[PDB]
């Protein structure tokens, strides 16, 4: 026997029932994928700033 | 050898012409579209008549051939072979398919083979046109009546204000010829150039 192949009939209503979620606020500032040569210089600069440095 | 014409009356499919994708199409029945006396000049035949379509449908090429022979033969009796020029306006460009019963598979793989051609016409579109002189003006609507009984649906017979198969009205055309400003082709009339290099 044959059954149905495909439909999207009820799927936009299921997509809306819990609201359309939004991504976490901290995903907008993740360092993942930035230049390493920029992320190296970023750490170096702060370690030598007494207002920012966190060395003991 | 044919299904009754009700099986392909309405425009249900997208147009399907003969191309490099559609092959094996049989030849249509109608092959002449300009009859009567087509080489007569523009100034000879000032009267024009039409047969306007009243439906959005499809006309077969078997029916187009029947209506061409009916109209043409009637005028070539009452008025002679050279008093009129009859043009068939619509051309059969659409292919209709048939899924042939005879082992027999029914609706599995049901895409059909070419079987014929039909012309796709719309509301108020001309199907036949006639231009004639005064000696035939009486008998053109009798020949258009003959053709109407070969065509499915409701059709309307009308007389135009234009001059023959030209684009000006008789009064407009008369005056333009009256002052000079109108061009002449072979059987068609145009306006003064008024553009481009002056003479040479």
């Amino acid at each position: 026997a044959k059954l149905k192949n495909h439909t999207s009939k009820n799927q936009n209503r299921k997509d809306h029932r819990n609201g359309i979620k939004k991504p976490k606020k901290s995903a907008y500032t993740s360092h993942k994928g930035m230049c390493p040569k920029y992320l190296r210089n970023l750490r170096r600069s702060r370690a030598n700033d007494p207002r920012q440095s966190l060395r003991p | 050898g044919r299904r009754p014409a009700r099986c392909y009356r309405y425009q249900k499919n997208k147009p399907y012409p003969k191309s490099r994708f559609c092959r094996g199409v049989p030849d249509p029945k109608i092959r002449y579209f300009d009859l009567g006396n087509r080489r007569a000049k523009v100034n000879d035949f000032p009267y024009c008549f039409h047969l306007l379509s009243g439906e959005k449908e499809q006309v077969s090429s078997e029916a187009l051939e029947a209506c061409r022979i009916a109209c043409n033969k009637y005028i070539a009796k009452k008025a002679g072979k050279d008093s009129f020029h009859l043009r068939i306006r619509v051309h059969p460009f659409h292919v209709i398919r048939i899924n042939k019963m005879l082992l027999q598979t029914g609706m599995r793989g049901a895409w059909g083979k070419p079987q014929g051609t039909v012309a796709r016409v719309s509301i108020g579109q001309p199907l036949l046109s006639v231009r004639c002189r005064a000696s035939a003006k009486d008998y053109v609507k009798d020949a258009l009546r003959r053709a109407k009984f070969k065509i499915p649906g409701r059709q309307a017979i009308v007389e135009s204000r234009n001059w023959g198969f030209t684009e000006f009205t008789k009064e407009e055309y008369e005056d333009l010829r009256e002052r000079g400003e109108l061009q002449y082709d072979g059987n068609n009339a145009h306006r003064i150039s008024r553009k481009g290099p002056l003479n040479l």
Partner: protein
């Protein structure tokens, strides 16, 4: 569909505009881009390296990375009930600086300017959605008289 390769369904969107074939003009490489800037994605079909997928044509995003040859852009993309923040790397021929906040910077500059001027009372600086028209007089010394026309066929 039955066939879903990377550049499927691209017959018109990746084609060039009429009489706009050939190399890109050199402003494509002399613009300065900065972290946090807004950009539009438009695929140039003659440049095949760092060419984003067709989903991203006609979206607006924000720069997160400035690389030697390519830029990193963040796009919000809806997937089946949630939004996802996607990150892509795209070469310069497919990016243009965006004016989505151009109108907002003109207004912020104009309100502080018109405050400095004070017109001794401060003007109303909120945007106003078009109000119904006020009362006024109009002359009818010369008035035209029309009517429906008859059917001509």
């Amino acid at each position: 569909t039955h066939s879903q390769g990377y550049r499927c369904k691209t017959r018109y969107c990746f084609a060039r505009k009429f009489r706009r074939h050939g190399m890109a003009n050199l402003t494509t490489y002399n613009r300065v881009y900065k972290l946090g800037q807004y950009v539009n994605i438009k695929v140039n079909g003659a440049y095949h390296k760092g060419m984003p997928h067709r989903y991203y044509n006609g979206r607006t995003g924000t720069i997160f990375n400035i690389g030697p040859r390519a830029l990193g852009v963040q796009i919000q993309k809806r997937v089946r009930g949630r939004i996802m923040l996607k990150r892509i790397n795209v070469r310069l021929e497919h990016v243009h600086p965006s004016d989505c906040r151009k109108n907002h910077l003109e207004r912020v500059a104009a309100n502080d300017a018109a405050r400095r001027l004070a017109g001794q009372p401060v003007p109303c600086l909120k945007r106003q959605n078009a109000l119904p028209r006020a009362a006024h007089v109009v002359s009818i010394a010369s008035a035209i008289d029309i009517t429906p026309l008859k059917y001509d066929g």
